[PDB]
Amino acid sequence: DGVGSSSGNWHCDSQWLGDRVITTSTRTWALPTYNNHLYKQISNSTSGGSSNDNAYFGYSTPWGYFDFNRFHCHFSPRDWQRLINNNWGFRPKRLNFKLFNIQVKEVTDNNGVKTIANNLTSTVQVFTDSDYQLPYVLGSAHEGCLPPFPADVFMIPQYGYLTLNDGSQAVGRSSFYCLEYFPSQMLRTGNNFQFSYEFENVPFHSSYAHSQSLDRLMNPLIDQYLYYLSKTINGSGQNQQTLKFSVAGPSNMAVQGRNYIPGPSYRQQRVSTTVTQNNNSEFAWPGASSWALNGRNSLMNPGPAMASHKEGEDRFFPLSGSLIFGKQGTGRDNVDADKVMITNEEEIKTTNPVATESYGQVATNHQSDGTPFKAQAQTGWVQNQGILPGMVWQDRDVYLQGPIWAKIPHTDGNFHPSPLMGGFGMKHPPPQILIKNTPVPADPPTAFNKDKLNSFITQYSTGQVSVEIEWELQKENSKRWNPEIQYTSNYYKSNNVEFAVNTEGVYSEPRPIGTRYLTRNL
Amino acid sequence: DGVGSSSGNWHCDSQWLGDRVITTSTRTWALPTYNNHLYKQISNSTSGGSSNDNAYFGYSTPWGYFDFNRFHCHFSPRDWQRLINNNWGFRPKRLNFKLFNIQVKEVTDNNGVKTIANNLTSTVQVFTDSDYQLPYVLGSAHEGCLPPFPADVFMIPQYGYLTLNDGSQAVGRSSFYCLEYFPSQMLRTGNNFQFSYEFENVPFHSSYAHSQSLDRLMNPLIDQYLYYLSKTINGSGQNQQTLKFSVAGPSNMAVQGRNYIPGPSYRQQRVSTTVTQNNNSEFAWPGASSWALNGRNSLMNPGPAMASHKEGEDRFFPLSGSLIFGKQGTGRDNVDADKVMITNEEEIKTTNPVATESYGQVATNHQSDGTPFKAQAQTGWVQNQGILPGMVWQDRDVYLQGPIWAKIPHTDGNFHPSPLMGGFGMKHPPPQILIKNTPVPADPPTAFNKDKLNSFITQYSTGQVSVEIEWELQKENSKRWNPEIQYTSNYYKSNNVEFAVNTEGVYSEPRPIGTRYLTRNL
Amino acid sequence: DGVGSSSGNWHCDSQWLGDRVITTSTRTWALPTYNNHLYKQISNSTSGGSSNDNAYFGYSTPWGYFDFNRFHCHFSPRDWQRLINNNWGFRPKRLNFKLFNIQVKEVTDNNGVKTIANNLTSTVQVFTDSDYQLPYVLGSAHEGCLPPFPADVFMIPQYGYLTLNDGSQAVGRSSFYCLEYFPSQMLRTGNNFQFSYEFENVPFHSSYAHSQSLDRLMNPLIDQYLYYLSKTINGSGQNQQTLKFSVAGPSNMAVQGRNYIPGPSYRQQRVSTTVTQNNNSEFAWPGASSWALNGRNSLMNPGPAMASHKEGEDRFFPLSGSLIFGKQGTGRDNVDADKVMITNEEEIKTTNPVATESYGQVATNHQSDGTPFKAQAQTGWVQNQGILPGMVWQDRDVYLQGPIWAKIPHTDGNFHPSPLMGGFGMKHPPPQILIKNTPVPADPPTAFNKDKLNSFITQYSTGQVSVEIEWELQKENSKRWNPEIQYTSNYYKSNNVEFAVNTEGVYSEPRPIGTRYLTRNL
């Protein structure tokens, strides 16, 4: 436990012990000095102004935090392929976290010459928010995760949070959090940090696609014993009203009585990847589904889990109803459609309604012959449908580069708190691990000054972080006779191997990989 | 356990042991050879074509299956009357199933003369899908159940199933199931089959009607301590705006604050049994409520549990919001209204909204005097209302000829998975019992041929099936003073006794019998 | 154990218990009377004459035999997909065989009317050749196996064998075997037959493809410490002979010294599936590789395991170097290339030489300047290469519809006795199970006659056969980062599901499935 002794080893592999997977990931991180050791109030005013919908108020802290809330942080693409091709479900069970091999380095820039030296006596501060007393910024699909490639060195993102705002201003209910008010472990080189976390009970993720649709669960050979209204008029002419009933059978599956109905919907605008088929107007914001909160409009993104498109309409995607990942090297603003990877939520069209279609039709009046307007039967489209009893649905798929978990907001009530971006919703998710370099002041004046010191030695830290997660598996025991669909590589020759490095050593993920390849009955 | 020894006895009675009922039913079945021992791919194309909404893809198997998912399979009408007149609730607890007295018979048709002989060495195959690995076709309200009359001999329906389809075609995710891939018990004459099943915990069915409505739960003698806005203008004329408040009391029950609100609605078209009152147009399909799934429209039938009609409007029924049973001898297509029995869901008007009415009104704008349009208060009808917190409702009633249970689809999420057609929703319902005659080939050629044999001895099997179900009872302990409504026969003379046989030995059920005759408070 | 009691149950499923698979298959068979209960000498003369290469001598017995020496007899396509996608190797360990539900039926044809009746007292004879005293006809890729689809009823093939021949004649060393000279179990209806067999130790089948080639096993960054002759002349002109040596390095991988060399070769003629590229002549027999035995030419089919084609030359296949399976419904003679499925042995091009190429070049002379002919260095192509020390190779792949095992001939010596058609070579394979209906004579004359009876009651038997095989698994533990190639179905829509039945109930296997999808290093 000294300068010349390593405080940990590199553990990066996966063990498949039957119904369990234990994934271990080790990475090398670099933590700079954020905010010059200061807490700073931030708002849209300090960011250059914005609209009402984009107004915010918060604080940026000098702390960094560790993010491993993405599946590629733990699963290699081959491990992901094994998991998705051989299992009907999975869920996290246990977590082990390690910080070790801490190195604090001081940087001196004299006459433009940058020299870096070791600071053996400097300390790095780390603690976990095990009581969830801090704002939870994981589960917001942020950058700064452990890189998917184990050989990549990553920078720890800076921790900030938002509070209640009235425009760019704060209200009396706004909370300010000082992270130095928490007990934290102080680490010199030779010290290591470790903590274990047990995942709370969450349902298995449905890593399967249904081979039956909700409207085709009947026996296609046997009639029903239920009748339906099939004819209301005997023919053309006046006063031909009648009531005729027929048996609902295989020839007319649409009218058959059913026990369960598709899940809820919140219609999204339909956008074509073939740009010539889209309207010649700007409708990204104006034509998007949204919800209002305290007078602020927020995009419904990705919203309720719905089928991306109908059968054969692969070129259509909902405006903001799907996760859109960026390809390697993709820029930040105004990138083309070929530089992004739009996830396709088609496997749930068997139970979930299509995102870009109406849920259905409802009657809107009373048809009558008189007493005295002679109104015909009128129907209206259902653009948004809330939860009804007897409704079943599938949640959004998880992806190799997608999020794993989210914190369920602490509220009086929630319904199906599975995160909308996909993953496992927990009231007590893995706690935030916050890290920060302890400030080392420069030489103070020889005469006392009451002002806080504002000159510090330039410093940064580096080290290794190890995350070990044990996942429970739900083995598939299907009796299906024909072979299933599996995720596979394509044998055809290419310049580069997919999910490998290119000639410049740049690792890339060419496509998003879901979990729903195996098949289950409804 | 031989040819000359019976392998079981006839058990058909009910025992009322206080808080439990044990119903036993024995029937004689006949199982033919289905599909000539073949699995056949079926689709709407092979059925003669159809529309997009009626397209399907699946397989017809040579197997038959046992159906007893109807209440008249276990309850005699007198037993049903006892149950509905003396109990506030009931639910299944245990199941016992028996197959015995198997007789396999061979049929030879020589020169048009049909002679039937015993085949003592032939075998019948039976197994239960206890792991739910096969598509579940029970819970689709299909024919082929055990006949309500114990003296009737019934034919076992053929088992088929549907998979994913793209029109009449299959997709790569479509599953083919071979039922010979399951271990099954092989029965000659003298062998019997038996298995027991324990029903999973389900809520008691509400076999009661509420004597209080949701909007009349207050004390009709005492005022509330809450106020409501009663007047907004002092009188006729300009600039008369004001705000007047009044105590919500017995004189104005409509404006009283309430804790709970009626359940969800999905408006249905209103149809009159008096055909002269209906519109002179065809609106059975065009005017019907529906939901869309993968671009296919399916009738909302019967949909969410809603009151069939308002008070006094017994002639009105929702277009597809109620179960319609056929009378004895009713044909298949285009039968008159007198040949069907339309169930009436009126007992739930105390908590559930009327199926053919709007849920209510919601404000659609901001009323104002200016700043500058002078908009009045505008309201819009709510045709469909999803689940809101604080909402209570009653599920659909069960009937003597209605279904008992349904399999909850295996999905990530569901809400109130009680089946919409009525009954008990279970994740592990009673398993499908599949039966099939083992093929007995005719004489093969004396020279080897690699082709599968396609000439078989014509065979069918017959036997007895016994189903014993134990039901838990919820005894009523009402303190109501006046006598209750009970189901009763009418003493008035008639040509035939109801729920008996006619002069030709034809058993008939004259009317549908619900469960909601006793009374409970809200 | 009587007429009215079943003697066994239908067992058809697979259990995946980690490192083991237990596949159980049950089928319905039909055994006719073969050869009219007679042993008949057969030869090419009795078959209508032939050439010298096709001459044979043998006997056809009245016995049938059970064949399950094909992988689709035990593995469903989904089980095969699991095995090939998740395992690096497999091998059989144990066998269990069952005959039960025997039914012997007599056929009487009076005046052209065929009536089939049960013969309860008739007996079926079955025994296993556990001592391998009979000629072994399994392992010859014959028809008559258990059908891949469990619902198909198959006819048991007739047992025959060949002995030494001189043309159509026999020699003194020819052996005649009477199968009634073996003790056999006699089964009436109600009797069952069972025996267990333990597979002898065989190597795991290599169900993987190499990700490294034999000529690319070096470090591509480091030179070798070995030198090679790079230049023999200083330039153009007389008397320019020299000897220059260079380091074998990454720039010249062809000349690097290597420890191991590709396996043996026996060149095959190259045939193009594009018929316009083939020579306009008949070369199927004349241009084929063959071996001679006692003056008889036999096709080298499929011969030593060699790569089917070079990279990119998928249209080329060796003339007789690959297994060619027939599609469902394919005829017997002169069928088109689209009616057969030619297996492609491309995964072994990393270690095995291409079947249609020369093994390499060898020097054929001494180059010299004189003493006095001035001979240049001459090389000759190696069309066939025997085993050399330091040679490594991969055996032929196994297929879902391919053979499982073969009997190693009882000889003084053999090398690598893995069967050339693919599978596991055993000195004591699963024994032949031979079955035959016991002859039931018709009414004999009332006066004694010494001649053997030649009038018998026409009879055939039917029943069920159960085969259970336990396979050991070699789990893969690869550290490869990128996803692997897996066998998968294609999601694209089609008229029929692959590996399912069509609209006429005809099961088909659309393509051959190998075992080599996972990846291993060399």
| Strand partners of residue B379 | B363
Tell how strand B384-385 and strand B265-266 pair up: antiparallel
Q: Does B440 touch chain C (CB under 8 A)?
A: yes
Cβ–Cβ under 8 Å, residues A518 and A480: no
Beta carbons of B177 and A481 less than 8 Å apart = yes
Structure tokens at C258: 């290597």
Which tokens sit at A404?
């794993």
Q: Give the Cα separation of B407 and B202 in Å (integer).
A: 12
Residue listed under structure tokens 């297994």: C323
What is the C-alpha separation between B144 and B67, in angstroms, rounded?
6
How far is CA A340 from its chain centroid? 16
- Residue B212 carries which DSSP code? S
**Alpha carbons within 13 A on the beta-carbon side of B310:** 6
The number of helices, as runs of H, and strands, as runs of E, in chain A is: 1, 34
Spell out the SS3 assignment of A281-341.
CCCCCCCCCEEEECCEEEECCCCCCCECCCCCCCCEEECCCCCEEECCCCCCCCCCHHHEE
How many Å from the N-terminal Cα to the C-terminal Cα in chain A?
Answer: 57
Distances (CA, A) of B39 to B61, B177, B179, B435, C493: 5, 10, 10, 15, 21
| Residue from B491, B376, B465 nearest B65 by CA | B465
Rounded alpha-carbon distances, angstroms, from residue B378 to A160, B236, B367, B368, B373: 44, 20, 8, 11, 14
Sign of the torsion angle spanned by Cα atoms C37, C40, C44, C45 = negative
Contact by Cβ (8 Å): C497, C510? no
Annotated binding residues of A for Ca(2+), as ranges?
344, 347
Closest CA to B457 of B60, B121, B186: B121
**How far apart are the CA of A318 and the nearest CA of chain B, in angstroms?**
14
DSSP structural state of residue B484: P
B82 sits in which H/E element: helix B77-86
C483·A484 Cβ contact <8 A: no
User: Backbone phi, then psi, for A284, in 5-degree steps?
Assistant: -60, -55
Matching residue, tokens 């998912």: B69
For C465, other C-beta atoms within 10 Å of its C-beta total: 23
List CB contacts of A200: < 8 A, sequence separation 6 or more: A426, A427, A428
| B468 inside 8 A of chain A by CB | no
| Contact at CB, B2 and C2, closer than 8 angstroms | yes
Cis bond upstream, residue C302 (ω within 30) = yes
Which residues in B111-152 belong to E strands, given as ranges?
Answer: 113-118, 124-128
Three-state secondary structure call for residue B505: coil
Nearest CA-CA distance, residue A505 and chain C, Å: 15
Beta strands in A69-157 (DSSP E): 87-110, 113-118, 124-128, 153-155
CB pairs under 8 A between A and B: 406
Residue pointed to by tokens 């749930």: A348
At B306, list the tokens: 């809603």
**Cα separation, A437 vs A187, whole angstroms:** 10
Cis status of the peptide bond prior to B302, with omega within 30 of 0: yes
What percent of the residues of chain C are helix, what percent strand, and what percent coil, each to the nearest 5?
5, 35, 60
Where residue A499 falls (left for φ over 0; alpha for ψ -120 to 50; beta otherwise) is: left
Resolution (A): 2.2
Give me the residue from C81, C482, C498 closest to A497, CB to CB: C482
Q: Helix, strand, or coil here: B297?
A: strand
Are residues C503 and B41, on separate chains, in Cβ contact within 8 Å?
A: yes
Residue C167 dihedral angles phi and psi, to the nearest 5°: 75, -130
Q: How far apart are CA A293 and CA A296, in angstroms?
A: 5
* Residues from chain C contacting residue B182 (CB–CB below 8 Å): 12-13
Q: Is there a contact between A379 and B287 (Cβ–Cβ < 8 Å)?
A: yes
Closest to B41 measured CA to CA, from A444, C499, A11, C466: C499
Residues of chain B by 3-state class (helix, strand, coil), percent to 5: 5, 35, 60
B509 CB-near residues (< 8 Å, 6+ apart): B72, B77, B148, B328, B400, B401, B499
3-state secondary structure of B199: coil
Q: What is the largest CA-CA distance in chain C?
A: 109
Closest CA to A318 of A289, A297, A359: A289
Residue type, A371: T
Nearest to A517 by CA among B288, C487, C401: C487
Give the integer Cα–Cα distance in Å for B278 and A370: 8
Token pair 């019907």: residue: B288
Q: A–C: how many Cβ contacts below 8 A? A: 85
- Partners of B324 on chain A (C-beta within 8 Å) are 226-229, 245
Distance CA A426, CA A408 (A): 5
Alpha-carbon span B215 to A321, nearest angstrom: 40
Angle at B448 between CA B447 and CA B449, to 5 degrees: 120
d(CA B306, CA B359): 11
> What pairs with residue C18 in β-bridges?
none
d(CA A501, CA B385): 53
Question: In this structure, which amino acid lies at residue A343?
Answer: T
Q: How far apart are CA B407 and CA A259, in angstroms?
A: 9
A78, A485, A500 member nearest C484 (Cβ): A78
CB contact under 8 A, C483 and A18: no
* Cα separation, C190 vs B264, whole angstroms: 62
State how far the Cα of C427 lies from the Cα of C448, in Å rounded to an integer: 49
Name the 3-class secondary structure at A514: coil
Question: How far apart, in Å, are the Cα atoms of B38 and each of A479, B104, B178, B460?
Answer: 19, 19, 10, 15
Tokens, residue A62: 């000098």
Which of C70, C190, C142, C197 is closest to C463 using CA atoms? C190
How many angstroms separate the CA of residue C99 from the nearest CA in chain B? 13
Q: Which amino acid is at B384?
A: N
How far apart CA B457 and CA A351 sit, in angstroms, is 44
Q: Could you give the CA distance from residue B332 to residue B334 in angstroms, rounded to a whole number?
A: 7
Tokens read off for B77: 């009408």
Is the Cβ pair B334, A230 closer than 8 Å? yes
| Cβ proximity of C453 and C444 under 8 Å | yes
**Contact B514/B398 with Cβ under 8 angstroms?**
yes
Radius of gyration, alpha carbons of chain B: 29
Calpha distance B390→B260 (Å, rounded): 5
In chain C, residues 109-128 whose CB comes closer than 8 Å to chain B: 113-118, 120
Determine contact, residues B262/B393, Cβ cutoff 8 Å: yes
The two tokens of residue A60 are 């940026």
Least CB–CB distance from B183: residue in C13, C36, C502: C13
Reduce the secondary structure of B3-61 to three states and give it as a string: CCCCCCCCCCEEEECCCEEEEEEEEEEEECCCHHHCCEEEECCCCCCCCHHHCCEEEEE
Dig out the tokens for B417 from the structure. 């998975």
Tell me which amino acid residue B358 is.
S
The verdict on a CB contact (< 8 Å) between B134 and A521 is: yes
Dist CA A65 CA A127 (whole Å): 10
CA–CA gap between residue C32 and residue C439 (Å, rounded): 11
Give DSSP secondary structure letters for C379-436. Answer: EEEESEE---TTEE--PPPP-TTSB-EEEPP--S--SS---TTSSEEESS-SPPEEEE
Task: Report whether C481 belongs to an annotated binding site.
Answer: no
Cβ–Cβ < 8 Å for B355, B307: yes
**What is the residue type of A297?**
N
Cβ neighbour number for residue A140 with a 10 Å cutoff: 11
Instruction: List all residues 6 or more positions away from A333 whose beta carbon is below 8 Å from its beta carbon.
Output: none
CA angle C473, C475, C476 (to 5 degrees): 145
Rounded alpha-carbon distances, angstroms, from residue B65 to B62, B144, C284 = 10, 9, 55
Is C10 in contact with B111 (Cβ distance < 8 A)?
Answer: no
Contact A9, A466 (CB under 8 A): no
Q: Smallest Cβ distance to A389: which of B273, B339, B416?
A: B416
CA–CA distance, B152 with A170 (Å, rounded to integer)? 79
The candidate with the shortest Cα–Cα distance to B186, out of C146, A479, C103, is C103
Nearest to B419, CA basis, from B147, B129, B210, B202: B202
Contact A259, B420 (CB under 8 A): yes
Neighbouring C-beta atoms of residue A260, cutoff 10 Å = 27
Residue A88 near residue A520 (C-beta atoms within 8 A): yes
Q: Cα(C497)–Cα(C494) distance, rounded to whole angstroms?
A: 7
Could you count the other beta carbons within 10 Å of the beta carbon of residue A305? 24
- Location of structure tokens 């296997």: C509
The strand pair at B261-262 and B391-392 is best described as parallel
Supply A127's token pair. Answer: 């603690």
Which of A12, A14, A481, A496 to probe the C interface (max C CBs under 10 A)?
A481
Query: What phi and psi values does residue B283 have, to the nearest 5 degrees?
Result: -135, 15
What is the 8-class DSSP label of residue A146? P
Q: Which residues pair with B160 in a beta bridge?
A: B60
The amino acid that residue C292 corresponds to is: A
For residue C177, the 8-state DSSP code is -
Chain C contacts of B161, Cβ < 8 Å?
none
C-alpha to C-alpha distance for B125 and B144, rounded to whole angstroms = 19
Q: Is A307 in the B-facing interface, judged by CB distances under 8 Å?
A: yes
Alpha-carbon gap, residue C80 to B426, rounded angstroms = 34
| Residue of C381, C51, C83, C370 lying closest to C238 (CA atoms) | C370
B80 marked as binding residue: no
Q: How far apart are CA A418 and CA A401, in angstroms?
A: 18
Q: How many residues does chain B have?
A: 522
CA distances from B62 to A290, B437, C473 (A): 52, 9, 35
C-alpha closest to that of C476 among A14, A87, A92, A470: A14
Cβ proximity of B423 and B71 under 8 Å: no
Name the method of structure determination.
Answer: cryo-EM
List alpha helices for C258-416, DSSP H. Answer: none
State the pairing for strand pair B290-293/A360-363: antiparallel
Is C498 in the A-facing interface, judged by CB distances under 8 Å?
Answer: yes
- The verdict on C263 touching B (C-beta cutoff 8 Å) is no
- Reduced to 3 states, what is the DSSP secondary structure of residue C437? strand
In angstroms, rounded to a whole number, what is the distance separating the alpha carbons of residues A94 and A197? 6
Q: How far apart are CA C45 and CA C59, in angstroms?
A: 13
Tell me if A397 sits within 8 A of A343, measured CB to CB. Answer: yes
Q: In this structure, are residues B516 and B206 in contact, taking their beta carbons and an 8 Å threshold?
A: yes
Count CB atoms within 10 A of the CB of residue A173. Answer: 7
- The 3-state secondary structure of C247-262 reads ECCCCCCCCCCCCCEE
CB A260 within 8 A of CB B419: yes
Distance CA C429, CA C79 (A): 24
Answer yes or no: do A225 and B282 touch at CB < 8 A.
no
How many residues make up chain A in this entry? 522
Helices and strands of chain B, counted as H and E runs: 1, 35
**CA atoms of A415 and A412, how far apart (whole Å):** 11
Q: Is the peptide bond before B439 cis (omega within 30 degrees of 0)?
A: no
C507: number of Cβ within 10 Å: 21
Instruction: Give dist(CA C83, CA C404) in Å, integer.
Output: 15
AA identity, residue A98:
K
SS3 for C141?
Answer: coil
Q: What is the C-alpha to C-alpha distance for residues A136 and B178, in angstroms, rounded to an integer?
A: 51
Partners of residue B47 in chain A, C-beta under 8 Å: 250-251
CB under 8 A, 24+ apart: contacts of A370-379: A374/B279, A375/B279, A376/B279, A376/B281, A376/B283, A376/B287, A377/B269, A377/B279, A377/B281, A377/B283, A377/B286, A377/B287, A378/B287, A379/B269, A379/B286, A379/B287, A379/B288, A379/B289
Q: CA–CA separation, A74 vs A146, rounded Å?
A: 9
Sign (positive or negative) of CA dihedral C368, C373, C377, C381 = negative
Nearest-Cα distance to chain C for B56, in Å, is: 12
Residue owning tokens 């602490």: A410
> In 10 A of CB C49, how many CB atoms?
11
CA separation for the pair A131, C471 (Å, rounded): 52
Nearest to C214 by CA among C253, C167, C268, C159: C253
Smallest CA–CA distance from C480 into chain A, residue: A78
A303 close to A393: Cβ distance less than 8 angstroms: no
What is the SS3 assignment for B412?
Answer: coil
Rounded-to-integer distance, Cα B160 and Cα B183, Å? 19
